[PDB]
C-alpha cells in the first residue's frame, strides 16, 4: 500500500488515474519527494500535477500535455476525488504528437512513465533533480544565482513599523512591539489553534495587519521552493484577505512566482489592494526569500500589472 500511514493525501490518491494516462506509477519513495506527501498535509492535486509534469516531462501544464479531459480532479467536502466535474485532466496525445518533432523520445516517455531529460533527450527513472524548470515557461522574473542555509529571518522590526493597531501573525510566533497581536498556528499556546494546511479558520476575526510568517524549505531549486510555497499563498495569504478590516494590510513570506500557480495567486491577491510591492529587508537572509506587501484592502474593481512586482523581484534577485 503506497499510501500507508497517511491521513491527508486524498490529492495524491486522486492523481493516480491522471498520472496513469502518461504511464506513471509512483512508488512510496517517489511520492516522498513531494513535501506534503512526506509530511502528510492537505494539498492541491492541480499544483502537484503541475509539479510532477515538470519533473517527469520538463514541461508545465501550460504546454497542454495533460489537457485531455480524461479524468476529473474534483473537491467534495474539502477532499480531492475523481467524481464527475468539468475539471478534467489526462495525457493529450495530439499535444504529444506536436511536441515530438522537438522532443523525439517524449512519446516513449509518456507511454512508459519515464522521465524525459530535457538536457539530453533521453529517458530516465524518476528523480526530482533532472528537470528543475519547465522549458515552455517564460519565467516572469530572474531566479537567484545561489542559495545558502541561513537562520530564520526575524521580521519583528518590519511588522512593528507597519501602520495598524491589530495584528494577526500566522505560522511561527512573532513578537510585535507596540501592537496588539493574535497568533494563528498549530501549537497549543496559539490564540487560534488549527492545522494551517486547512487554511485560515472562518471563525478567525478581522485585523488591521495579517502577517503570514510561514516558510517553505529549499531542496532542489528556486522554482521548486516557489511551487512548494504556492499552496500556502492560496490557503493562508489569499484567505487572509477575508479577515482584513477595510484598508488593512497583508504581508506574506514568499519566493516570487517562478511557477504558474504562484503567479496566478499573487495576481488575484494584488487586485484586492490599493498598493502592492515586494520588499527584502536587511533581516531577510535566505537568498530566495522576499516579503509580498499588500496595503489598503478593498473590493474596488481594478487591474494589476504583474510587470511591476516582476521588475522588483528581478531587481532583488540580481542585486539590481
From Swiss-Prot:
- The UniProt entry annotates the motif Nuclear export signal at 54-63
Mode of membrane association: Peripheral membrane protein
Give the subcellular location. Answer: Host cytoplasmic vesicle membrane; Host nucleus; Host cytoplasm
Changing residue 8 to A has the effect of: NsP2 is in a self-inhibited state
In this chain, the stretch annotated as Nucleolus localization signal covers 2-21
Outcome following mutation: residue 59 to A: Inhibits the nuclear export of nsP2
Residue limits of the Peptidase C9 domain?
A: 1-320
Its signal peptide is none
Catalytic residues as annotated in Swiss-Prot or TrEMBL: 10 (for cysteine protease nsp2 activity), 79 (for cysteine protease nsp2 activity)
Short sequence motif named Nuclear localization signal, residue ranges: 177-181
Superkingdom, taxonomy of origin = Viruses
Outcome of mutating residue 195 to A/K, per the record? Answer: 16 fold reduced kcat/KM for nsP2 protease activity
How changing residue 246 to S affects the protein? No effect on host shutoff induction by nsP2 at 6h p.i
Q: What does this protein do?
A: Multifunctional protein whose N-terminus is part of the RNA polymerase complex and displays NTPase, RNA triphosphatase and helicase activities. NTPase and RNA triphosphatase are involved in viral RNA capping and helicase keeps a check on the dsRNA replication intermediates. The C-terminus harbors a protease that specifically cleaves the polyproteins and releases the mature proteins. Required for the shutoff of minus-strand RNAs synthesis. Inhibits host translation to ensure maximal viral gene expression and evade host immune response.
Q: How does it assemble?
A: Interacts with RNA-directed RNA polymerase nsP4. Interacts with mRNA-capping enzyme nsP1. Interacts with KPNA1/karyopherin-alpha1; this interaction probably allows the active transport of protease nsP2 into the host nucleus.
The UniProt comment on domains reads: The N-terminus exhibits NTPase and RNA triphosphatase activities and is proposed to have helicase activity, whereas the C-terminus possesses protease activity. Contains a nuclear localization signal and a nuclear export signal, these two motifs are probably involved in the shuttling between the cytoplasm and the nucleus of nsP2.
User: What protein does this entry describe?
Assistant: Protease nsP2
Organism field: Venezuelan equine encephalitis virus (strain Trinidad donkey) (VEEV)
Organism taxonomic ancestry:
Viruses, Riboviria, Orthornavirae, Kitrinoviricota, Alsuviricetes
